[PDB]
């Protein structure tokens, strides 16, 4: 077996119906081998290349791309569906690179894998189409994950009171958020998403959690107190622990929380003297002037003995930050998406070992 798959051109629409349009992300076969639909489609591309059949390669690629776009339009509100197709679009792109026969993409190949390179067609124009599509599919995933998290954020990060996580004497909780992040991470891993892509997804969703949290704090009257600063610092420390548990500290995710971290620190720091003001100006390098001024204006005294922050103290901070080219924006842009990349991730999977389970309904294709 050479690691190719043959099909009759008459069956191309049934191929993509069964492998893409109607394929269930929870099926046993594709969970035993993550990326299986991408490997099978690539093995089909190999045989059309072997035949030197331009029109068959063109038809298969168009049918494949159109079918992935159709699934994501119809069911693209579903996290598992979007994760699954993002993962498989990426793996299909990696296969087209790894088996292109271009020297730069072959550095991690076995001898046998090099024997599986395409021999008749340069598919660089389709690789570029797939890369461009992957950017948009990732944006779709980010918005689906945001919509799921959004109702939990303020309740769990701000409204739910704890004492270092424990109910105090004195709806969604911090634990709700962490369990939901757990679910997102589990599903991406089950789908074989690239580790470098999972890192980006996690950085983006930490950015969203921090930005929704800080904007909500800036827009209400009751979240700027010593007590709430303590709570926010605890909650962020558990988000950092989640990263450590997942071995994701190098994702950049913790750094995206710096504006919320600094706002919470402003709730704790001394707020009286000119040295206190200088310290705030050096500390708050991830908050705009308007954000610093808002938190200090909102700050609630810890008891009846404490005065509100004085207006002259706030003015001192405003005056000493004038040199900033500071954006007068009060709110973080919670819709920002960090530009995503898909670094080449070759696979050790040996194509000649791939079996086609009966459960996919692909009996009409043949191993070559």
């Amino acid at each position: 077996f050479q690691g190719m798959l043959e099909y009759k051109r008459e069956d191309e629409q049934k191929l993509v119906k069964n492998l893409i349009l109607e394929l269930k992300p929870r099926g046993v076969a594709v969970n035993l081998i993550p990326g299986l639909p991408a490997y099978i489609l690539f093995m089909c591309v190999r045989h059309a290349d072997y035949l030197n059949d331009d029109q068959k390669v063109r038809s298969l690629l168009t049918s494949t791309i159109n079918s992935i776009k159709k699934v994501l339009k119809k069911r693209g509100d579903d996290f598992e569906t979007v994760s699954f197709w993002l993962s498989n679009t990426c793996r299909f792109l990696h296969c087209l690179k790894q088996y292109s026969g271009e020297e730069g993409f072959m550095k991690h190949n076995t001898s046998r894998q090099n024997e599986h390179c395409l021999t008749n067609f340069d598919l660089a124009e389709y690789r570029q189409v797939l890369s461009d599509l992957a950017i948009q599919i990732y944006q779709q995933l980010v918005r689906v994950l945001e919509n799921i998290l959004q109702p939990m954020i303020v309740s769990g990060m701000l409204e739910h009171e704890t004492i270092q996580g424990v109910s105090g004497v004195k709806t969604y909780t911090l634990d709700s958020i962490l369990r939901q992040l757990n679910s997102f991470h589990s599903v991406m891993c089950q789908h074989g998403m690239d580790p470098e892509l999972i890192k980006q997804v996690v950085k983006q969703m930490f950015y969203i959690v921090g930005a929704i949290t800080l904007n909500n704090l800036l827009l209400r009257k009751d979240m700027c107190s010593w007590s709430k600063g303590m709570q926010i610092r605890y909650n962020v420390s558990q988000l950092e622990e989640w990263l450590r548990d997942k071995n994701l500290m190098n994702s950049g995710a913790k750094e995206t929380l710096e504006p919320l971290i600094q706002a919470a620190q402003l709730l704790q720091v001394k707020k009286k003297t000119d040295d206190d003001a200088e310290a705030i100006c050096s500390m708050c390098n991830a908050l705009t002037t308007a954000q610093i001024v808002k938190v200090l204006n909102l700050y609630t005294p810890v008891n009846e003995f404490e005065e509100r922050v004085s207006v002259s103290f706030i003015r001192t901070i405003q005056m000493r930050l004038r040199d900033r080219k500071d954006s007068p924006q009060l709110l973080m842009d919670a819709k920002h998406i960090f530009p995503v990349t898909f670094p080449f991730n070759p696979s050790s999977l040996a194509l000649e070992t791939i079996q086609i389970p009966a459960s996919l309904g692909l009996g009409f294709i043949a191993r070559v």
Partner: peptide, 23 residues
Amino acid sequence: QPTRRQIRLSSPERQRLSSLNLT
């Protein structure tokens, strides 16, 4: 490594294929 044929897309075909939302 053989010389391979680059499969060329037209610009309208490329635009349609690479637009996620056209479907």
